[model samples]
Target chain A: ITVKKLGSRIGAQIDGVRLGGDLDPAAVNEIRAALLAHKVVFFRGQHQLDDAEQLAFAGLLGTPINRWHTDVTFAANYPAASVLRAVSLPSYGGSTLWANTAAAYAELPEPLKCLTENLWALHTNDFRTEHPVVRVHPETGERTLLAGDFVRSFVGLDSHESRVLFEVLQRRITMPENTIRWNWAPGDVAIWDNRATQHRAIDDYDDQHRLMHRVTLMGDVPVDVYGQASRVISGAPMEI
Target chain B: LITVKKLGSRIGAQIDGVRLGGDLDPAAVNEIRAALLAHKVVFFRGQHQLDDAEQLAFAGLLGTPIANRWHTDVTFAANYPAASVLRAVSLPSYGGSTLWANTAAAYAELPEPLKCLTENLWALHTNPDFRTEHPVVRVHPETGERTLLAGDFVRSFVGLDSHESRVLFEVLQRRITMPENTIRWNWAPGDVAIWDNRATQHRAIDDYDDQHRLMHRVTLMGDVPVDVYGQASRVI
Candidate 1:
């Protein structure tokens, strides 16, 4: 399959593949590589994949958005990747934006970079856990800022200090220069490396209906630059 | 009378509803400048009415005007133009599109090992009579963002051998041309594109065959290129 990049930092469109249960293994691996490199990869006109077909297609790769986040960060083992299939779309104004967190971490100022490399943050959604502020991707070995909507507070800082530092880090994570906006069409599929990117669904098409189906691949616990695994404060790991 | 529609994640935007001419207001000009800084390259369509004099006037409103072939305008000069405005005079039926890559994004995405290797490196750029040494990574004066200083004029990395420099240059330069960091624009008769030279590298596609394509450019004078440590480029 040929891959055409949609943005500088975060997205690509993969052509020549028909998503189905009987796809080739090599193509699946190539698609995974594309997702790893581009952070997010899209496929258009895959209208044939119903719920079951999409699930099977997702299974071919080892896997698998909202509010500019890596999915389900509250879980001990957050999803490594997600496969999203667009079932219905509005007439206009429902694009999705994804940012390259790895690129964001790369551009952090020297002082902030030093701060985050040794920092840890608490994340909760009924299930509480602590993960590195700068996570090392399990597969690609790239460094990414792991903060998003689920993060509750910094591990060592007070609430006031956490908010101050978090805002500064979050601003870099969502910069327009490090992000990609995708205008979806019916039958479009987006697969992203949850370890390397953060995504948000635009809420502009208020009166219109949009439907999507997703399957997430189970992930290992996140590790930091110091090679320490994420600590579970109150939640068990997500199971398959 | 202007609405900016971003064309890519990093580099390009198409500004709609604004007509280019000699009679634009300061607010309009200021808004355009803001768009240029944010998008790196901005496009204006349906400006068939803009003449060379008017185009130059519009260029002055922004910064300067300036090219084809795949290089930033006059990097051979110590103070190359900060930006360039190009107006399409004539175009082929199809083909002849232009592509520009965001150098800032390229520098941002370099592998960690490569980033460490080139953070303080310098390169010699030569166009025969014009030769100078510019930092391989230049810090943008106004934005404080870092970008790669490379293009057709780049000869070799300073203090490195010819073979090693060529290999290193090829590896670093390839990042700027990657499909992910670039935007391609198709030319229309009245289309005018303004791009920030400090943060971009551009090239004209040579697929028009026998068809003639013409454009007029004006370039703004820029300051000396500076490195991360504030060292400025020097004539060789």
Candidate 2:
């Protein structure tokens, strides 16, 4: 019920609600709006929220899917939730960072802005799929840069040019001004919109013990401003 | 005496031990041609001694000069339209450096896909133009290397919408004008730089105000530019 902004550009924290119980429809609507506007939001004092409660909370927003996560294990009861742990850490340091994709799309120079708006990029996992370089948010109708760490390259461009351009886009998306860093705590929980953000987990803790759990919400087929929807070359969408 | 020193990793060179106005033998002429190809723009310091006639003679040894109506505020010595001095009658308070870009290097640096795309296209150049329709990728007449022949004079493309044309033009323009492909020259009292007009483009910084800078230019007549496919430029 109470909200506090964490940074000028990206994150916010919400209080007066616990993830361990059912959320009212009005409260859910407020949380979705806040998530869309802020890109990422954090909830504190959620150590009591076990696997089932986390799944129930995530289901209120979107269909929880089993993301093709490279590392981290899925919850035994809820396959949609991924649990990550840092068993050993260095003397100090273990933090995570997330970037606002919409912010990156907004600041591109005029020529690149026009060019990227029309271009599509390939995303490869177990198989290849195509997504727009600029994805129009299905719910908010806002544009976001979709070529994050998983992007293979821009379609129709040579590999060299595509690599060069991707590097530029990636750097712009993660610019310090457009990003927010979170140093995790024991009972803290963070939730983000994967559709509008790309996150990185920093492993500065070489031997210290750290643990975190994540639940990925399913995504819609990304569409471009030009009305052409993304084509899945292979690999099924994460089934609920 | 002719020696060529690389000024940058990709462009420009400082030439020493060569007198521009003096007798240039066949050996000197060949060396100059080779150096010109290697370094898109070569600089000659202390050419303050050479006059307008001597400059023309020096250019004559390199290539034939083409004379056309070039509009400028400066005077043209000897009524030579192609050979005129870029006189800095007035300069700004600071920053009037001249820049010359190596079009050959620019063309070479393009991604293969873009290079292929441009190979099939032609650009329109306007203003003082006896030749207007030039291949977007021009083949160097001497070295036979492909060079992007379009510049500020380029108005548009042959068959593209305003948006697409502008995007392509801007991309190509940015690539060709990248710092690695250009050489910024600070002019001295008597420094002379003669570049192959067919393989490079030059622009004045136009920064120094209330100052006078005058320098004569001797343009050599050049053969029509051709593409890799042997298509000569279409003159309008």
Candidate 3:
């Protein structure tokens, strides 16, 4: 694994070790602290973790999220985590993939972040009416851009147009600036911060099979640090 | 190029050695096949997708496409897996690929042991009541109508009821222990990739979404996979 700054952005590529256990306690603390300061961390070539292990490793970062509930794979019993299965394309491979939203959020798009900094994201009891943009962080105490309007109708668009906006925005938020790429090595447990970054598996394993198992820490109810209370009605609140 | 362990090292591949089929050779496609099979997939280096030809070159490696009753843009295998060129006028470094899943064949033949694991799964048939489990595996459209795919998602099989489903779904779903089955592809600005929903499942990597992950997907429905799970195929 290697770490180097591409510029203002801090990027690191790691290999030759598992995310957990491969590091000593002192080393673990250092890595955690780096994640906190650097806002993003990267490790390449990680392996060796089962469901329990994947969940446990995520615990080191924050709360493990139950992805299975949302996944078509299961229900309340267990969140099967975001596991990528490799279909033997007889020629292609997307063996194993994972992402860290927490990492990329740290390196967010300046324009969108600044615009969202002053704006507020509305909330809804429905949870399905989730906002597309918000300024808050459940843990770091920093006001960041969630611009998650992926699910909501676009901000100013009318009802019909809003639906289209929401879908467009949903895909927009995951641009490269908001993303980090990781390659999977056999035995690589690539854990990522879902909050700060959005990761994707390029997913083209030619005729070969590639699979990835994941466990995420439970995400904090997104906090609206801007102190937004009005967002509930509009599904977005203005910063106080 | 570099045969190393911990395949997680490179997010993108600088595919070398394999030849592009059209202008490339069969031997090269065979090498590509070896890479895909051994590595569960392979990446092509510098094959610019100015049009569908290059992308079709990749899709052509596997099998011929069959016409389905579903979509119009989605009939030929070349209609899929063709190089996609996604670009927003204003955004440059934005846009990437997103993948989905539906392994009907694999889901159907869960070994008794495997079924015993997920038998209690009460999966929400995401599609209302209208969405029922349809037999997934069927014969290949080309390839002598070979019944290749079998593991489509089975609705009533295990995860049908609510609470009773979770206990079982987790057990069975957890048992699919091959990381090699997941696919990952890297995209350059104009790079395009097409995949067969019949043979694979995909997820869009969030790597390029910051600029807004805008992509135009041309999907083609596939023929049902052949059901080989009866009293025939040996249980693993």
- Among all candidates shown, the one with the greatest DockQ: 2
Candidate 3 CAPRI category: incorrect
**Model 1 root-mean-square deviation:** 20.2
* Model 1 pairs in collision: A64-A83, A64-A217, B64-B220, B65-B218, B65-B219, B66-B218, B66-B219
Which of the two candidates, 1 or 2, achieves a greater lDDT against the reference? 1
For each candidate in the order shown, give its overall lDDT on alpha carbons: 0.83, 0.67, 0.36
Evaluate candidate 3 by giving its C-alpha RMSD to the native, one decimal.
Answer: 27.8
DockQ values per model: 0.01, 0.05, 0.01
Per-residue error for A238 in candidate 1, Å, reads 0.3
For residues A1-240, could you state the per-residue lDDT of candidate 3 as single tens digits? 334432233334444446653456665666555554444455543434556655556665545441100221011111212322111122334432223334333443432333333333322322333332443554555454343322334343234433432333344444445444444445543333344443344546544554445554444344444554222333222111
Residue A154 displacement (Å), model 1: 0.4
Write model 1 residue lDDT over B98-117, tens digit each, in one string.
99989888888864434555
After superposition, the stretches of candidate 3 with alpha carbons farther than 4 Å from their true spots are: A1-11, A15-18, A21-23, A36-48, A65-91, A95-129, A147-150, A155-157, A160-178, A206-208, A229-240, B1-236
Q: Per-prediction TM-score, please?
A: 0.51, 0.54, 0.36
lDDT against true structure, model 1? 0.83
